[PDB]
Amino acid sequence: MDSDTLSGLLENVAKKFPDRRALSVSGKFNLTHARLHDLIERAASRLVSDAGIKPGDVVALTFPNTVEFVIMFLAVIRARATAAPLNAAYTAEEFEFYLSDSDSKLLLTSKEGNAPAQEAASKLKISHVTATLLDAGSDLVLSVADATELVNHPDDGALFLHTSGTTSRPKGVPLTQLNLASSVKNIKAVYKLTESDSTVIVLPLFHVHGLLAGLLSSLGAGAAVTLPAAGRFSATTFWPDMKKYNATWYTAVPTIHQIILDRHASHPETEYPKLRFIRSCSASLAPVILSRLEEAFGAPVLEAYAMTEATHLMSSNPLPEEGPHKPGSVGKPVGQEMAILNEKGEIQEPNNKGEVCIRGPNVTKGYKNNPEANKAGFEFGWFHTGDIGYFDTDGYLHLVGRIKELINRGGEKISPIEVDAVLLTHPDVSQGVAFGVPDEKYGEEINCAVIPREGTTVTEEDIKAFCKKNLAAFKVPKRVFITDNLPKTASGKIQRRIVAQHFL
Numbered sequence: 001m002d003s004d005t006l007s008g009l010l011e012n013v014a015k016k017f018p019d020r021r022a023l024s025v026s027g028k029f030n031l032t033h034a035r036l037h038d039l040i041e042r043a044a045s046r047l048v049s050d051a052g053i054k055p056g057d058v059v060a061l062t063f064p065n066t067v068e069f070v071i072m073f074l075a076v077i078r079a080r081a082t083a084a085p086l087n088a089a090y091t092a093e094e095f096e097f098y099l100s101d102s103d104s105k106l107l108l109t110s111k112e113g114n115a116p117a118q119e120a121a122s123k124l125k126i127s128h129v130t131a132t133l134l135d136a137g138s139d140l141v142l143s144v145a146d147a148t149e150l151v152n153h154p155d156d157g158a159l160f161l162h163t164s165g166t167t168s169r170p171k172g173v174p175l176t177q178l179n180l181a182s183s184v185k186n187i188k189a190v191y192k193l194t195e196s197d198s199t200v201i202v203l204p205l206f207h208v209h210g211l212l213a214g215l216l217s218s219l220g221a222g223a224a225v226t227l228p229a230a231g232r233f234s235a236t237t238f239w240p241d242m243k244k245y246n247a248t249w250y251t252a253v254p255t256i257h258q259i260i261l262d263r264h265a266s267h268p269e270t271e272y273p274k275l276r277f278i279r280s281c282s283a284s285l286a287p288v289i290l291s292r293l294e295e296a297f298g299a300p301v302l303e304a305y306a307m308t309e310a311t312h313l314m315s316s317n318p319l320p321e322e323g324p325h326k327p328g329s330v331g332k333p334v335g336q337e338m339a340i341l342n343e344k345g346e347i348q349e350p351n352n353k354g355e356v357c358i359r360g361p362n363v364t365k366g367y368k369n370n371p372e373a374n375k376a377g378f379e380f381g382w383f384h385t386g387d388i389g390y391f392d393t394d395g396y397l398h399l400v401g402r403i404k405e406l407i408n409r410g411g412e413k414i415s416p417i418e419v420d421a422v423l424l425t426h427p428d429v430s431q432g433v434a435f436g437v438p439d440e441k442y443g444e445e446i447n448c449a450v451i452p453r454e455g456t457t458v459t460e461e462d463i464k465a466f467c468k469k470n471l472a473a474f475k476v477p478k479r480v481f482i483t484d485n486l487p488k489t490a491s492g493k494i495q496r497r498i499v500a501q502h503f504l
């Protein structure tokens, strides 16, 4: 059943499991793998014959998490075109930038549309076409007027995204059919996803975590995916959806797991479904959150490490049946090479820190139009992640942090990851984030911000005293900012430099 293109893999899945459920919209749609497959084929045929989509063309998509997004995403890559999913919340200015930068030739939206995206597309003279799924007797309806021997090549572009800009400049990342097929195989393999598995999407599908792990790897296993009725995560409908659609796992970022834990505290379900595992990725999972999750929902919590340039998955803790999962660790490399290198590019022995570097068929060939970033980031096939970590003697990776977020206090580098984990263990802390700030005496100093739990009162001195009991003195935040809100990216991450800037 494996293939080196995602479209080929999905064709194999549809032929083997045509009547298994593939894609549900809560309360509304329940598509099987054959039905979904054919909706995609017919939509791709319309893209080629009626919307003039040629191999190598880029098609932008901006949708909530909907059935139309799934169908059209897969129709675009099936037509040998590159999908560029974009955040529906962008301004017309941002849409204009991303549409121009990706070389999009077409903009797809729902029937309801998106006014800023359409404004940007009109200005750039990029065609706009809408997509609507009506009922189970009809093809998906495209607003363009009136596929079989399309051949998908592994090196065809399939997915185009941009990097976050947390520590560097936002760069364009082109990913191929081969990149996608490889990551879907890796993700399926390490979690042993099969056609009996089922999940609910609780992350945006325009970022690789929700897209590759939640959606595409499920489909690639003949498994089922459910989208929330309202096109985005809802803490109140989450467990009803997980129960009704027989979910066996889910994946989220730590901030979303925290929201789910808060909901369990204020409104526990009388019963929870028994899951195979719960997955965390994209930002550090504090050990205390791992333990709270395992206690609350009774399933093993497996942390993974991933990035856009690796088409999501790089490493993961394994299934209990294959090995332990370690709090504070992101587990072992899956289906790719990984090495810890010092600044002279020498491989490090276990328990020696250095830059995490990867090599494999899941890794982008290179940033778009950025020969200097490619010369700096790639060497003999190996990509430099910008993350500092080390392997323990079991070969499990422990992340220390992004190179440019480590706090250099008088020659000693502090890990904000480490301190975050400690902050979240304070009885009255709901959220917390440590960050580096300038310091006249030490060059850099560590500060942090915390959000107290509802109805609790916390002081800077409380937090500092608690930190002192649990960290070497040099790591203790010198200033503690109390606040009621920490901004998050759409990918569910708190950006350290933004918080720092806000409180300085």
Ligand SMILES: Nc1ncnc2c1ncn2[C@@H]1O[C@H](COP(=O)(O)O)[C@@H](O)[C@H]1O
Residues within 6 Å of the ligand: 163, 164, 165, 280, 281, 282, 283, 284, 285, 303, 304, 305, 306, 307, 308, 309, 330, 385, 386, 387, 399, 401, 402, 491
């Ligand atoms: N499990 C994790 N723990 C800590 N950091 C992570 C984890 N997964 C991803 N990251 C970080 O997220 C970055 C990728 O972010 P992006 O590709 O911009 O969505 C990585 O290079 C790491 O710095």
